[PDB]
C-alpha cells in the first residue's frame, strides 16, 4: 500500500508529516503488432518447379533468382516433394535469413543416383554431370516423375555424361559431344574401337522399380555478396490494433505506445514523423497509406500525502499531471 511504498522509498519505519514522491504510474502494453508492406512481386518458382519439361542432367538448367520475394513455405507445403535435403543452413530459418542471389539447377536422374547430389559424394553424376562443392550453402529437392517422364515405348529425351577425361568442377556444366578417348589410338570423331560417345540416354519406362524411376531434381544454391541482398522471404504482418497501449514494429522500428488517428498530412515520400523534442511521434502504415500518432502510455508521478505515522496510518494519493478519468 502507498504507506508501505513510502516506507520502502525513505528506508525508514516512521514517516513524518508531509508529501513524498515515491514512484511512477505507467500503463503496460498487452498486444504486439508487426507490420510490413504487401507481399507482392513473388519470385518465379512456379516456372522452375512446376515446369512441364526439364533439361537433361548433363545440361542441367541454371536459373538466377533475385529482386523478388521468395516464398519457401510453398515448396515446404507440397507433399509430392518427398526428398528435401539441405546442407549448410537450417530449413526452418530459410524464411528469415536474407541472401543476395538464388541459383536453381534443374535436371532428371534415376534412383541410385539420387544420393549422389550431395557434397563429398561421387559417381557418374558427381564426376561428369553435376558436381557439388564441399562448402555448399543450399538445399536440394527431388521428386518422382514417373507419370510424366516415362513412356511405355520409352523416353529417350534425357541424357547423362558417362565418360570424361576428368571430373567436373563444382557448378560446372559440360555440354561437349567430343568422342571420349579410351584407347591410345586417336578417335578422329568416329566411335569405333576404344571410342565411345560420352552421353548415354536414360530409357525411362513406367514399369521400372523405385530404383529406376525418373526423378526431377532442383538444387537451390544460395549466395550472399557485398551488394545489398534483395532475395527476401515473405514477411508476415500482424493485424493492426488501435487506440490502446501496444508494442509495435514498423519496418524494423521498435516502439511502445497508443496508436491513434492523426490529422498530419505526410508527403508521399515522407515516412516517419518527429516532434519538437526529436522523438518519433507519427508513423505511416506500410500497408495502408494512413498516418498514426504514437502517444506514450499514460504517465504519472505518484505522491503520497500522510500525517506522521505516530498520529495515523491513513494516506492520500496524488497523481501528478493526470486527469481523473485516466486512472
Amino acid at each position, epitope marked *: 500500500d502507498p504507506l508501505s511504498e513510502t516506507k520502502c522509498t525513505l528506508k525508514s519505519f516512521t514517516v513524518e508529516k508531509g508529501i513524498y514522491q515515491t514512484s511512477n504510474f505507467r500503463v503496460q502494453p498487452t498486444e504486439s503488432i508487426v507490420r510490413f508492406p504487401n507481399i507482392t512481386n513473388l519470385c518465379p518458382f512456379d516456372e522452375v518447379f512446376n515446369a512441364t519439361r526439364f533439361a537433361s542432367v548433363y545440361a542441367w538448367n541454371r536459373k538466377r533468382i533475385s529482386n523478388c520475394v521468395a516464398d519457401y513455405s510453398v515448396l515446404y507445403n507440397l507433399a509430392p516433394f518427398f526428398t528435401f535435403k539441405c546442407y549448410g543452413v537450417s530449413p526452418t530459418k530459410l524464411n528469415d535469413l536474407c541472401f543476395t542471389n538464388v541459383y536453381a539447377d534443374s535436371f532428371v536422374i534415376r534412383g541410385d543416383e539420387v544420393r549422389q547430389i550431395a557434397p563429398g559424394q561421387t559417381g557418374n553424376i558427381a564426376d561428369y554431370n553435376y558436381k557439388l562443392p564441399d562448402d555448399f550453402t543450399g538445399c536440394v529437392i527431388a521428386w518422382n516423375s514417373n507419370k510424366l517422364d*516415362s513412356k511405355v515405348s520409352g523416353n529417350y529425351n534425357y541424357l547423362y555424361r558417362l565418360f570424361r577425361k576428368s571430373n567436373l568442377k563444382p557448378f560446372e556444366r559440360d555440354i561437349s559431344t567430343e568422342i571420349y578417348q579410351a584407347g591410345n589410338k586417336p578417335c578422329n570423331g568416329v566411335a569405333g574401337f576404344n571410342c565411345y560417345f560420352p552421353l548415354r540416354s536414360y530409357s525411362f519406362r*513406367p514399369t521400372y522399380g523405385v530404383g529406376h524411376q525418373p526423378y526431377r531434381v532442383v538444387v537451390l544454391s544460395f549466395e550472399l555478396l557485398h551488394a545489398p541482398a534483395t532475395v527476401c522471404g515473405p514477411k508476415k504482418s500482424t493485424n493492426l490494433v488501435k487506440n490502446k497501449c501496444v508494442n509495435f514494429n514498423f519496418n524494423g522500428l521498435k516502439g511502445t505506445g497508443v496508436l491513434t488517428e492523426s490529422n498530419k498530412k505526410f508527403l508521399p515520400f515522407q515516412q516517419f514523423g518527429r516532434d519538437i523534442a526529436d522523438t518519433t511521434d507519427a508513423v505511416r502504415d506500410p500497408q495502408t497509406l494512413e498516418i498514426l500518432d504514437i502517444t506514450p502510455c499514460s504517465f504519472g508521478g505518484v505522491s503520497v500525502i500522510t500525517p506522521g505515522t505516530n498520529t495515523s496510518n491513513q494516506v492520500a494519493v496524488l497523481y501528478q499531471g493526470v486527469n481523473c478519468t485516466e486512472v
Partner: antibody
Amino acid sequence: EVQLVESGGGLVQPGRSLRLSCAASGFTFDDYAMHWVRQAPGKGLEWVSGISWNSDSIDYADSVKGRFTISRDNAKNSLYLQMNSLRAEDTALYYCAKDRGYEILTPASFDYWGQGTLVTVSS
Amino acid sequence: DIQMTQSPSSLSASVGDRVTITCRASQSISSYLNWFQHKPGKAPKLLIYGASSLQSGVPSRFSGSGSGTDFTLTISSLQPEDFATYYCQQSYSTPPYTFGQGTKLEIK
C-alpha cells in the same frame, strides 16, 4: 478457364473425307500434348488419337489405324484431324482433350477437355 | 491386354448420404488410374488424377483411394449438382488410354 473450340462436324456419306479443327487459346500450346477421344451415342468414352508437344511421337487407336491422321499447328495454336474412309460406326461424338504431360504415352492423363462436336456418317 | 470392370452401374441415394463407387482391373496398373466426371450437358471433367491425388479446383468431397487392382472413389456430401457419369481410365498397360464402362449416379 482455358478455351477449346472445335469445328468441322456435320453429316457426310460413308467413305468420304472431312476435317476437324480444335483451337486452344487459354494456355501455352507449344509444350502440351493433345488428344482426340470418342464418346459413343450409347456407350462410354474411347481414346482415338493424340499428338505430343512436337510432331515427333504419334499414336493412333488400333481400330482406326491406317485410316485417320492428325496434324498440329503451333503457329496458330491448334490441331487438325483428317477423317478418311468413314464407315457406319463413326457417327459418335468427338472431344479434344488436353494431356497434362508433354509426350504421347505417359501415365499422366488428360487435364482439360472441350465440348464435343457431333458428326454423322449416313446417306 | 487389360480389362476394366465397373461393379456398380446405377445407384440411388439422397442429398445427405454417402456413396462409394469401385473400379476393378484385370491386371495391376501400379495405381495408375484416373477418374473422370462427365455431365450429360457439358464436356467431361477430371476429378482424381493418379491413385489418391485430388485435382486442384474441385471440391475436396470426392476422395480417391486404392492401389494394385481395385480402386475406389467416395463422395461424402452428395451435393445436388453431382448428376453425371463416372469413368475410370488406366494409363499403365500397353493399350493406350482405355476407358471403362459408365456409372450412372442419381438420387431418389
